[PDB]
Design a protein around this nucleic acid. Structure first.
Ligand code: MG
Ligand code: MG
Ligand code: MG
Lengths: 109, 51, 56, 199, 236
RNA sequence: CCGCGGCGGUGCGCCGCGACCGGCUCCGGGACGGCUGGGAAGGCCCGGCGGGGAAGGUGGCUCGGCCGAGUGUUACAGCCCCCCCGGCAGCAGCACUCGCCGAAUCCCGGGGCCGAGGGAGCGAGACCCGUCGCCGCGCUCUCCCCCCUCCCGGCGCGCCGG
RNA sequence: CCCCGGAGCCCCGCGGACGCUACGCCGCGACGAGUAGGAGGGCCGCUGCGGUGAGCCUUGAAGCCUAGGGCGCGGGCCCGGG
RNA sequence: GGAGCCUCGGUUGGCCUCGGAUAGCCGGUCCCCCGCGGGGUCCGGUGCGGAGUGCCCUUCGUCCUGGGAAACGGGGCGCGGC
């Protein structure tokens, strides 16, 4: 009856200064800021969840306007608890500075 | 042929050098032996502390 | 000198290099030492008939 | 869902740095009491540094050239604008989240407002070092509304002192209330200190 | 048909040796001194006039395709799911409590009953309390809370297994084309055996849960992440 | 037509799992060697031998209630410290993490990630298939016994006989 | 101590691919910047000739156009509709 | 109150002293001064801040009946005045 996903912001792509490598998102998971606090989140399912003009299908549901791009937090990115993700398609860039949901549900807990 | 890494893949190590089996049979047993003997020292030290 | 790092390897170093990255030169084709049949075929005329002999 | 940061006691660029990254991660921020921001380095030092910035103008038509904003809010906005990619769409979007004020006006004058302790003067400077209030600085470079901003803030502080007195009054009654009731909240109050509050 | 005369030391390393095993197995004293055309192989039947007829079991085919794929390469160690070994997080022990993370029973709290043959969990958030029946779940989509009921001596039915907790309907042909055929059928009906199973199991648990104060109320409730509380910080 | 029997290729579209191997990156455990056959330490205390700061001391003065606190001097040991002789098991590169270098003197278990890329059966009365090398084992064709007990059988949940 | 028109086959010397356009097919290694310049291959492309497709074509050739479907690393190509 | 294109972000709230930093916070004043408060002194508490943003508030299944502790609290987009 509430929220079963931890909040996270799409920081932007894995990139060098002047070559962005679009196939790898970086994820600022809310409340975690140490390459330490982040072994929880390794290998968790994650959703860029967004809605669009035309209708879609929906697993166990009637046709909707919301769509998602699924992905997976792979590894911890640099000291201050950023995390790398990788998504079944690359994230839009429209997406920068927006919510992506890091689930709990490939749990090892 | 795929190179399976001997150092991870026990049976590949054995294929290349069968004396590994024994060397590793020893050094499980050896380490267990000594681990037991450490507990036995620790129990005697606790008994000496109680006395 | 300023093109290399070098020095005196351990026993373990010689093992780890040979087992993890031991590749024969066998008819000028870099081939991985998957069996002693390879080492023997080439070095067996010296008494070297296995990975272990090679390491020694 | 929104930062409100009391810019008093902070350091101009030090705060702006932190605000920029918040703003780039979609955080809507408000920065309040910007005249109270204070800049390291003795006053005179910084006045000249501003006065130099004033000199910078597009010779052939100043009307185009770098617009030197006087108000401390706009100054602080300018320095945060200098740490975003503000020529981009995403940069421009980022600034649109940030909302700066000389003094502390009516939405936020009854909101609790945070303090970035990593930009704070008492922490980041040696006590024997000198600094400048961005107000004074703003005032002398042509900011019109110092005194107005002062006269409105004396009202606010008087208005707030009242709120605090009533707040205190409730807190006090609540401390009394517990003592009045502490045999019929005793086996609740016990359980809230096995799992470690109330201590 | 004796068991394994050397035990396991490590996966792939027996405790003993070659030489100890020779003596244990006793290879001394167990020394084994041991120094078509006309006749048709596999057809044959009966029959009347002329005589008996020689049939041919497995008769050569009446169509060859124009091209067909050519074998594979043996491949060593690739077991089918049934023959797999099954794991279980040490956290999940019998009569522990879970938070089911994924399905319709989502965030609902539950009691864990057993690991089935499959490797799935069997589960019950006693239908009574929670509205979660006898039900399968996966280890991987479940949080093993550090809260246990003592479920030791409850006789879960032997007959309830993977095979029973398994979806049922739909065959092939019928009328098919039009605006009909198995878009209806409509409802999974609960059945009476299923209701009887639940009734039996819950009663054994249900007293046990209650003994723990507030536990029923905990098992009624639903888990969800509020503000300021982060999975990685908190424990369950 | 029902068998979804045996084999072969497949999935309309979106999904998930599982175990096996390869390559990685981490985590947790343990067991060893060497040294100034580590240095310091701890613990027990005993007998001596001096030296130093500076003391349950004394003393000038000051500050508080003979006592407590703050400076100052000669300095023994009734606060300690340091050297020297002689001797105990508790040490152990020590979870009292004070300072190394390592591993035929080294092993076990666990997690995250990416990838699977090949295809030694195209016979007419008898397999549409295994498998090579390595590990051992495991088993049996040798007898013994012991235990537990899952199925089944028997006797009184207990005991006896795969 | 016997014969494969039958040992039943992990090797079979009695006969031999699903495979064998031998300018074909298959396996192992290694390597791959490039102006000027050189060489090879183009089932890349244009126009005409000898051959050849019992080719195609008023039941619609060439050309032209195409937010149609594809192939090829590419030169290019093939189909759908107009 | 009913349908119905489109644009999206979101997925508990926090309703506030002032400020200090070689200092602060809270009480209570027995006592004194000022306009239930404000200022003072004195005393008593806290101070790696529990009258803590390392915080607080809020609960997250629905109903039934039939006990206890808690109990006049909540509502009707309940309605008029200050
Ligand atoms: Mg080249
Ligand atoms: Mg050229
Ligand atoms: Mg939604």
């Amino acid at each position: 009856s509430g929220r079963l996903w931890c909040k996270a912001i799409f920081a932007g792509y894995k990139r060098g200064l002047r070559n962005q490598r679009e196939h790898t998102a970086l994820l600022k998971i809310e409340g975690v800021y140490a390459r330490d606090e982040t072994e929880f989140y390794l290998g968790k399912r994650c959703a860029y969840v967004y809605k669009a003009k035309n209708n879609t299908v929906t697993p166990g549901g009637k046709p909707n306007k919301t769509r998602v791009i699924w992905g997976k937090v792979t590894r911890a990115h640099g000291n201050s608890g950023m995390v790398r993700a990788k998504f079944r398609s690359n994230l839009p860039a429209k997406a920068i500075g927006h919510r992506i949901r890091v689930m709990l549900y490939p749990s090892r807990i | 042929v795929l190179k399976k890494n001997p150092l991870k893949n026990l049976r590949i190590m054995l294929k290349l050098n069968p004396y590994a089996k024994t060397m590793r049979r020893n050094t499980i047993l050896r380490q267990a032996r000594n681990h037991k003997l450490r507990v036995e020292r620790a129990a005697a030290a606790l008994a000496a502390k109680k006395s | 000198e300023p093109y290399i790092a070098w020095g005196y390897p351990n026993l373990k170093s010689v093992n780890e290099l040979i087992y993890k990255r031991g590749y024969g030169k066998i008819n000028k084709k870099r081939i991985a030492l998957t069996d002693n049949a390879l080492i023997a075929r080439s070095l067996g005329k010296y008494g070297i008939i296995c990975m272990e002999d090679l390491i020694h | 869902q929104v930062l409100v940061l009391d810019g008093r006691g902070h350091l101009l660029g030090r705060l702006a740095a932190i605000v920029a990254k918040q703003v780039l991660l979609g955080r809507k921020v408000v920065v309040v009491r910007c005249e109270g921001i204070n800049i390291s380095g003795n006053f005179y030092r910084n006045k000249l540094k501003y006065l130099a910035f004033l000199r910078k103008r597009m010779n052939t038509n100043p009307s185009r050239g770098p617009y030197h904003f006087r108000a401390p809010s706009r100054i602080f906005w300018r320095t945060v604008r200098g740490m975003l990619p503000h020529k981009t769409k995403r940069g421009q979007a980022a600034l649109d989240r940030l909302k700066v004020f000389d003094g502390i006006p009516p939405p936020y004058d009854k909101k609790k407002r945070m303090v970035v302790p990593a930009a704070l003067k008492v922490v980041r400077l040696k006590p024997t070092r000198k600094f400048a209030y961005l107000g004074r600085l703003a005032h002398e470079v042509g900011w019109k509304y110092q005194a107005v901003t002062a006269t409105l803030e004396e009202k606010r502080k008087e208005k707030a002192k009242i709120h605090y007195r009533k707040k205190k009054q409730l807190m006090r009654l609540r401390k009394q209330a517990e003592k009045n009731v502490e045999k019929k909240i005793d086996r609740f109050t016990e359980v809230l200190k096995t799992h470690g509050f109330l201590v | 048909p004796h068991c394994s005369r050397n035990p396991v030391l490590v996966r792939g390393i027996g405790r003993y040796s070659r030489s100890a095993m020779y003596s244990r197995k006793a290879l001394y004293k167990r020394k084994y001194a041991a120094p078509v055309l006309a006749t048709v192989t596999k057809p044959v039947g009966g029959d009347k006039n002329g005589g008996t007829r020689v049939v041919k079991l497995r008769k050569m085919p009446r169509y060859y395709p124009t091209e067909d794929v050519p074998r594979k390469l043996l491949s060593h160690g690739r077991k089918p799911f049934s023959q797999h070994v099954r794991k279980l997080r040490a956290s999940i022990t019998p009569g522990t409590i879970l938070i089911i993370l994924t399905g319709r029973h989502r965030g609902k709290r539950v009691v864990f009953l057993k690991q089935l043959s499959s490797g799935l969990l069997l589960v019950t958030g006693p239908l009574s309390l929670n509205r979660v029946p006898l039900r399968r779940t996966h280890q991987k989509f479940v949080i093993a809370t550090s809260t246990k009921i003592d479920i030791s001596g409850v006789k879960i039915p032997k007959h309830l297994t993977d095979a029973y907790f398994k979806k049922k309907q739909l065959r092939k042909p019928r009328h098919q084309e039009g605006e009909i055929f198995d878009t209806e059928k409509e409802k999974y009906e609960i059945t009476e055996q299923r209701k009887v199973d639940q009734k039996a199991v819950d009663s054994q648990i249900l007293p046990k849960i209650k003994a723990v104060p507030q536990l029923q109320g905990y098992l009624r409730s639903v888990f969800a992440l509020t503000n300021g509380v982060y999975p990685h910080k908190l424990v369950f």
